């Protein structure tokens, strides 16, 4: 076989240890999910906008009492109601409260006021993978692999809790002071025991079954991992066009082309992740995540060492101080206006 | 030719 019978026994013991870990992690998650830390806006100084989206923005804030810096996501309640996003915003808060994993951003506070919802999370000063990747062009395969391994372990954790993530992309992956990945933006994360039906995500990263309005499962995250690995190693994603409709047509087609510098091991992995046929997609078969973890492209990956953060990272962001924003791009700064009248109170009773 | 800037999520197709 590929492994001697001893190496095979080591791998087996390793896989049983994973099951033991995930069983404990489920017990801890459920304790928090059933029986869940507020603050208020004037407890923080607002420093700088770190990112912007349809419903609001993320701001660097400084907690007045402690001097700690955080990233505060601000959502305009009226804009959230205007869409099927009420449920999604409640999903994000509830999931972030309850999960615990080294590569998942930690939520510190949440609160709401007349106009907005607020989630205050750990500030990750190394910046988005997105801007490092766009600056350097593409990551070498070892560098991409180090990040990919952290996503594989994070999805193994989330999926074991019946959580789908649904928005993997470099924009949502921050680099910490040790060069490891922090996954952010749980706005589309959801507890799903079997299938779900919402058309949501980011065009370049959507699995075909989402685009085709089919009920879908956690395998959409494994497709998205294929897109991410391709983009990290190529510098651009596999289904690449100026308009969403053109992107969707490429995704459904069942065709991918690879740069000539991709190793054959990488291409083989990607053909099995970017697999339209769900009966053949890695991560969706009888052996589950182990088809990915045991793939040749990951043969050098020490999964436990990655989890334990023992591996030297390929890139350490420059860090000048705890509130330094030099690794983030600039955004237009807008006033944070709070209405004197409560908006959408009944819709957000549970937040 | 494709999108090189930050990509926004979609809530409906
Ligand atoms: N820039 C950051 C954004 C987030 C967020 F979760 F996406 F909101 C967390 N921490 C950051 O440093």
Structural class of chain B: little secondary structure
Which CATH class of the largest domain in chain A is shown?
Answer: Mainly Alpha
User: How would you sum up the major sheet of chain A?
Assistant: 5 strands, antiparallel
The strand count of chain A comes to: 9
- The side-by-side strand order for the widest beta sheet of chain A comes to 1-2-3-5-4
Distance, first to last CA of chain A? 54 Å
Estimated radius of gyration of chain A: 21 Å
Number of helical segments with 4 or more residues of chain B: 0
Identify the quaternary structure here: heterodimer
**How much helix is in the residues of chain B?**
under 10%
- Number of domain units of chain A: 2
Rough outline of chain B: elongated
Quote the distance from N terminus to C terminus of chain B. Answer: 22 Å
The coarse overall form of chain A would be: globular
Bin the helical content of chain A.
25-40%
Q: Greatest contact pair?
A: A-B, 29 and 12 residues
Task: Describe the structure in your own words.
Chain A: One of its GO terms (cellular component) is perinuclear region of cytoplasm. The complex is a heterodimer of chains A (351) and B (13). With 351 residues, chain A is of the alpha+beta class. Chain A has helices at residues 5-34, 77-81, 85-98, 129-136, 141-160, 208-211, 219-234, 244-253, 264-273, 290-293, 303-307; strands spanning 44-53, 56-63, 69-76, 107-112, 116-122, 163-164, 173-175, 181-183, 190-191. Chain A folds into two domains: 18-35 and 128-318, Transferase(Phosphotransferase), domain 1, CATH 1.10.510.10; 36-127 and 319-349, Phosphorylase Kinase, domain 1. In chain A, a hairpin with a 3-residue loop joins strand 4 (107-112) and strand 5 (116-122). The longest helix of chain A is centred in the N-terminal third of the chain and has 30 residues, at 5-34. The radius of gyration of chain A is 21 Å and the shape is globular. With 13 residues, chain B is mostly loops. The N and C termini of chain B lie far apart (22 Å). Classes of the chains: A alpha+beta (351), B little secondary structure (13). The interface between A and B is medium-sized, with 29 and 12 residues. The complex binds 3-azanyl-5-(trifluoromethyl)-1~{H}-pyridin-2-one (8JW). Residues 50-51, 58, 71, 73, 105, 121-124, 174, 184-185 of chain A line the site of 3-azanyl-5-(trifluoromethyl)-1~{H}-pyridin-2-one.
């Amino acid at each position: 076989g590929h492994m001697g019978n001893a190496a095979a026994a080591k791998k087996g013991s390793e896989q049983e240890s994973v099951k033991e870990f995930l069983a404990k992690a489920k017990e801890e998650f459920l304790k928090k999910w059933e029986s869940p830390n507020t603050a208020q806006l004037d407890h923080f100084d607002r420093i700088k906008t770190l990112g912007t989206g349809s419903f609001g923005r993320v701001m660097l804030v400084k907690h007045k009492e402690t001097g700690n810096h955080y990233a505060m996501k601000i959502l305009d309640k009226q804009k959230v109601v205007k869409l099927k996003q009420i449920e999604h915003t409640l999903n994000e808060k509830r999931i972030l409260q309850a999960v615990n994993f080294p590569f998942l951003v930690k939520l510190e506070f949440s609160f709401k006021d007349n106009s907005n919802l607020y989630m205050v999370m750990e500030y990750v000063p190394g910046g988005e993978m997105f801007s490092h990747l766009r600056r350097i062009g593409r990551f070498s395969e070892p560098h991409a692999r180090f990040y990919a391994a952290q996503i594989v372990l994070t999805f193994e954790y989330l999926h074991s809790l019946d959580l789908i993530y649904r928005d993997l992309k470099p924009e949502n992956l921050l680099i910490d002071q040790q060069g490891y990945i922090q996954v952010t933006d749980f706005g589309f994360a959801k507890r799903v025991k079997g299938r779900t039906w919402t058309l949501c995500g980011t065009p370049e990263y959507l699995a075909p079954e989402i685009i085709l309005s089919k009920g879908y499962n956690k395998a959409v995250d494994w497709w998205a991992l294929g897109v991410l690995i391709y983009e990290m190693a190529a510098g651009y994603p596999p289904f690449f066009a100026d308009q969403p409709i053109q992107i969707y047509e490429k995704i459904v087609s069942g065709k991918v082309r690879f740069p000539s510098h991709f190793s054959s091991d990488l291409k083989d992995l990607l053909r099995n992740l970017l697999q339209v046929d769900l009966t053949k997609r890695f991560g969706n078969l009888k052996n589950g995540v182990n088809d990915i973890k045991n793939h040749k492209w990951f043969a050098t990956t020490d999964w436990i060492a990655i989890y334990q953060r023992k591996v030297e990272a390929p890139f350490i962001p420059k860090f000048k101080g705890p509130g330094d924003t030099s690794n983030f791009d600039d955004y237009e700064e807008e006033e944070i206006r709070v209405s004197i009248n409560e908006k959408c109170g009944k819709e957000f009773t549970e937040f | 030719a494709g999108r090189t800037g930050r990509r926004q999520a979609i809530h409906d197709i």
